[PDB]
DNA sequence: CGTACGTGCGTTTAAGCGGTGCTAGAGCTGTCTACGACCAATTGAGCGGCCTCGGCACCGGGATGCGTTTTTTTTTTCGCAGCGGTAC
DNA sequence: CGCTGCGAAAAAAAAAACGCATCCCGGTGCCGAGGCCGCTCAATTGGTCGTAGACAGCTCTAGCACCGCTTAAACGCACGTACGCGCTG
């Protein structure tokens, strides 16, 4: 046979890999262009310190990261593995970000 | 154009792996790319105020700030 | 210390619990080492051999697949 | 002999207590708890009437709504009991303890 | 010296109910009356001090207020 | 399938009430002191340019341990035919 | 016959082989820390003014005890039912 980890084994070693490092996850460019979008919306033709696209992606990815681990919480808390939008949508609530 | 498509299923991964998740459902990308929406959204707004009632056309690293601290959200390390 | 044949092992703890819904696979696992002797698989022998009954016609299932669900006796 | 089945008496007492606005606390216990509390604080400490019942205001309230969480954290869990653990879940989402 | 037994179990169930809450653990009451303390203590603590720089004897109802406040579980109508 | 709540009827309690009695302590008034705002002038602490060299990321190249399969073995666990002693 | 022994046969389980990912070793090479150069504006000095706050008391509130009557809760126990919990497919 050709050589295979087992489901879950993988994602774990990128559990290790991603909490041992600092380094942003999402795309710059993508980013970037994600956030000129949703600036269009409140004013046209802006500008953007390169330090003021940065401190945001810092600001977004560290929010997720601290959400996806209060939803992890509510899938454990249903003994799943699994989050679900049900989970994230409980942390939501209980955060008292939506109603 | 539509950018919120890129922010790739991997990326949301990473994030996910980041924050301790084994194992993730296909409906989490579009709810998470979701709420990172609102996340920026508010967030940019309350920027943009700031960079508007100081009279300029260039958001500044302080105008992300003081909207991330305005909104409960603290940030250390680019000023302020 | 004998612990007989999945062909008559605890036919006993089944025919010596009359029940409508007939006896389930938790109730007989709570017999076999209540009074017989057994290993540690055991349950998953007593499964083979609901299951070896169920496709021939020997012991009949009430509800449920597989292991899962009450089965009686033949008659 | 009109008896109910468990959970159909509750369902009435939560449309009682959900209607209502009285504090549900008994008063006095309650005054003492804050002076016990106080003591360790300050001893020989004196306390406005006012003071106590603007903290019984906030305390039932803090509850009331730890309980709205706690209960939903419950059936999240496919449950319909409220158990320590559910609570314990809320405070660390709500920021209360790591 | 133990008076957190005085929050009767009837009168903490009464605090659920109003909170939507159909059906209670026995081991609730206790982990209940256990979060009232901190919750209490963590306030009367900032309480008391708002009281001790006052140079007063006795807490009054504003110190409970700018404690409630300082605390984030603001309250309205003692002197807001 | 097991059990731990929920209802309810029956005892135990002590909260609540309304009023009374004593007194700390809140919270104000006037007086006067010490402390801090304001200004001016004189400084050097602290900041924006330069110019290294060394700590850090990197890279490729073995080395340690960690998970996968899958090979060989150890231990247990039935079932079939091949015993040694009964019985006669 | 029963016993038994063996011979599987069945998993267990182990071991061990394989191959893969994570660590670490030691010499590059690059860039940003860390340390000098002047220099400028913000901290210090010292000293004038005027008023915030310390104190010494004067008042009258409002907070702490005591005290039985009257209940509505609490305590509590017993019985039974609906729910939480675990295994399998
Ligand atoms: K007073
Ligand atoms: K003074």
Known sequence: ?99 | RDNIQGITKPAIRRLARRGGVKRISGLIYEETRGVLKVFLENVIRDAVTYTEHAKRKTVTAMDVVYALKRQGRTLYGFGG | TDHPKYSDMIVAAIQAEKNRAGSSRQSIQKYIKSHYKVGENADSQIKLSIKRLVTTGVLKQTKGVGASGSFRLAK
Request: hydrophobic share 40%; net charge positive; aromatic share 8%.
């Open chain 1, 1 to 99: 046979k050709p050589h295979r980890y087992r489901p879950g084994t993988v994602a774990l070693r990128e559990i290790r890999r991603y909490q041992k490092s600092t380094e942003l996850l999402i795309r710059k460019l993508p980013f970037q262009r994600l956030v000129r979008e949703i600036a269009q919306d409140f004013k046209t033709d802006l500008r953007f310190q390169s330090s003021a696209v940065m401190a945001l992606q810092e600001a977004c990815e560290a929010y997720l990261v601290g959400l996806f681990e209060d939803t992890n919480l509510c899938a454990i808390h249903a003994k799943r593995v699994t989050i679900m939008p049900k989970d994230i949508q409980l942390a939501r609530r209980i955060r008292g970000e939506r109603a």
